[PDB]
Design a protein around this nucleic acid. Structure first.
Ligand SMILES: [Mg+2]
Lengths: 448, 100
DNA sequence: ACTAATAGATTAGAGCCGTCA
RNA sequence: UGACGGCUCUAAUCUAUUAGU
């Protein structure tokens, strides 16, 4: 019988310094922030893949609409939303061998066949980069098994952007099953898939669609994720870390402090002191050099709870007064509510408080402007708590709700969890394919 | 909005329609409503329009109403609890390997 | 000191489905 | 890897209680 607390929905920035709520709504309204026109593209693969990719590229030029448009807005032409020239008449194409030098059946060794295929693709791409004369930005690899991890890891050392597309994506019309019916039906999301592909291509080309300008100056945010690596001793180290929003000349810095600080244990997860201070110093020095000053507040995200001696080590790191506050987030607590009447769920934005520390937040539900729900069944909320430090309880709630929009890999209205942990997790698996790299690149476009 | 609303113009004071400090889409909606109520001459939509007739406004119908509602939870409460619990040690009430 | 069992409570990996009547 | 969510199973450490030596 306790009342709930609603929190407003922060807005994003767009061209000419305006604001909106749905990113694609603003895109159709104004468009991007910065200007990018270099989309000279190259494609490698077989004849069928090249032909279908060219057909798709000439198809995307005209506007298209989905089955229902009250939820998903209209998709105009690509020149009519961003402003560029994307065409199939300026593509550099190369042909993979038509015959197979790797046996068709995965009988000898599936790992060996995957390594051979990635070796062939990597060598062809490197020869193309180091031999030819043209200038290219992206590469749209068609595929006729944990493959792309190795390819991204092996292409990391050459600093070339890339993207992967599967053959089953485009030819769903004639890709019938064994009974003659199509396996996949994309007669409902074609506009949104076009939106996502265009946004991903524009980001990879070197252009940011939207930024943020309603954040408190002088504060910086951090996140940590943990993953297991299993070679001989199964030593779980991870510590891939994430990005940070250090203030600058009216921008949104998103570089991430990377480098898997080794933690040599099999069951211990939290942290070790020397790696802790190394990580914190590496995170802090970038702010120190960029802002030529010192931060006033440090915020730490965590996906799991952490020990105490790490905080003992971190206490001396605080230069003068910049106290660091560390919080934890989970993803599963059974509190499935039900609306008293009708057949409709609850809406996102409501928060629940049990004390000064714990809190339940609902980032899944419905939004009236979409008229529908983000989830299929009744949504379930998430839990937040300030593990270490003292801060206002609604501050972290509104902050964690604020960071649920910077999802550059898609264009959904909102996402389940904040992206600070999401991007760290995303880079985690692809960095661990081969850890023989020293000082990896810090930009967030090479890693997807 | 840097200029004060005082010195707008000498021969415009009697007229007041709209400002644009807030945003640029709700203003479009207001101007469209004004043109409709004053009956600006109509133009054919070529049977392809009226799709824009939804997102041309800044928000479709998103608002903040204060009407109250109730929700049914999933937990079940307990009112009465036993006062005490008992404690003992005899060490051969049952066979050791025998389970409890 | 550690290898056997007891259960509660955290934690991460993978593998299946629908696509919003 | 288009992208999201909702589910299922498998396993694993940290406490705290035993008895074999
Ligand atoms: Mg992606």
């Amino acid at each position: 019988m306790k009342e709930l607390i609603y929190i407003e929905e922060p807005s994003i920035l767009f061209a000419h310094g305006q604001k909106c709520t749905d990113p694609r709504d603003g895109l159709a309204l104004f468009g991007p922030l910065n200007q990018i026109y270099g989309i000279k593209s190259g494609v490698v693969g077989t004849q069928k893949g090249l032909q279908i990719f060219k057909s798709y590229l000439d198809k995307i030029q005209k506007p298209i609409y989905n089955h229902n448009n009250i939820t998903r807005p209209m998709f105009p032409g690509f020149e009519a939303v961003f402003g560029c020239k994307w065409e199939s008449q300026n593509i550099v194409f190369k042909e993979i061998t038509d015959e197979e030098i790797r046996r068709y059946l995965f009988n000898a060794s599936t790992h060996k066949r995957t390594y051979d295929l990635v070796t062939l693709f990597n060598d062809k791409i490197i020869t193309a980069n180091k031999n030819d004369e043209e200038r290219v930005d992206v590469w749209f690899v068609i595929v006729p098994a944990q493959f792309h991890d190795q390819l991204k890891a092996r292409l990391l050392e050459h600093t070339i952007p890339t993207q992967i597309l599967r053959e089953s994506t485009l030819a769903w019309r004639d890709f019938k099953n064994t009974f003659g019916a199509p396996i996949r039906d994309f007669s409902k999301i074609e506009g949104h898939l076009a939106w996502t592909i265009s946004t991903a291509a524009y980001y990879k080309a070197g252009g940011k669609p939207w930024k943020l300008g309603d954040i408190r100056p002088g504060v910086c945010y951090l996140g940590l994720v943990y993953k297991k690596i299993e070679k001989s001793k199964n030593p779980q180290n991870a510590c891939c870390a994430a990005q940070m929003f250090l203030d600058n000349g009216d921008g949104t810095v998103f570089k991430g402090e990377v480098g898997p600080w080794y933690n040599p244990e099999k069951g211990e997860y939290h942290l070790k002191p020397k790696e802790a201070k190394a990580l914190l110093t590496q995170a802090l020095e970038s702010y120190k050099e960029q802002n030529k000053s010192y931060p006033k507040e440090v915020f730490i995200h965590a996906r799991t709870r952490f020990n105490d001696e790490e905080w003992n080590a971190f206490n001396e790191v605080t230069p003068k007064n910049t106290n660091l506050v560390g919080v934890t987030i989970t993803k599963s607590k059974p509190l499935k509510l039900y609306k008293t009447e009708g057949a409709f769920p609850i809406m996102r934005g409501n928060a629940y408080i049990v004390d000064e520390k714990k809190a339940f937040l609902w980032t899944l539900g419905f939004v009236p402007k979409l008229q529908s729900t983000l989830s299929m069944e009744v949504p379930n909320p998430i839990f937040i708590e300030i593990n270490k430090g003292e801060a206002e309880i609604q501050q972290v709630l509104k902050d964690i709700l604020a960071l649920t929009k910077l999802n550059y890999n898609a264009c959904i209205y909102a996402d389940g969890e904040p992206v600070t942990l999401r991007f760290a997790n995303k880079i985690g698996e692809i960095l661990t394919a081969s850890t023989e790299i020293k000082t990896p690149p810090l930009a967030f476009k090479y890693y997807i | 909005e840097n200029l004060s609303y005082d010195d707008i113009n000498i021969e415009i004071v009697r007229l007041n329609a709209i400002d644009f400090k807030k945003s640029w889409a709700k203003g479009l909606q207001d101007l469209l409503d004004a043109f409709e109520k004053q009956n600006v001459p109509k133009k054919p939509p070529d049977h392809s329009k009226s799709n824009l007739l939804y997102q041309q406004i800044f928000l479709h119908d998103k608002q903040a109403i204060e009407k109250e509602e109730t929700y049914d939870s999933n937990w079940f409460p307990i009112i009465s609890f036993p006062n005490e619990l008992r404690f003992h040690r005899y060490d051969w009430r049952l066979p050791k390997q025998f389970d409890v």
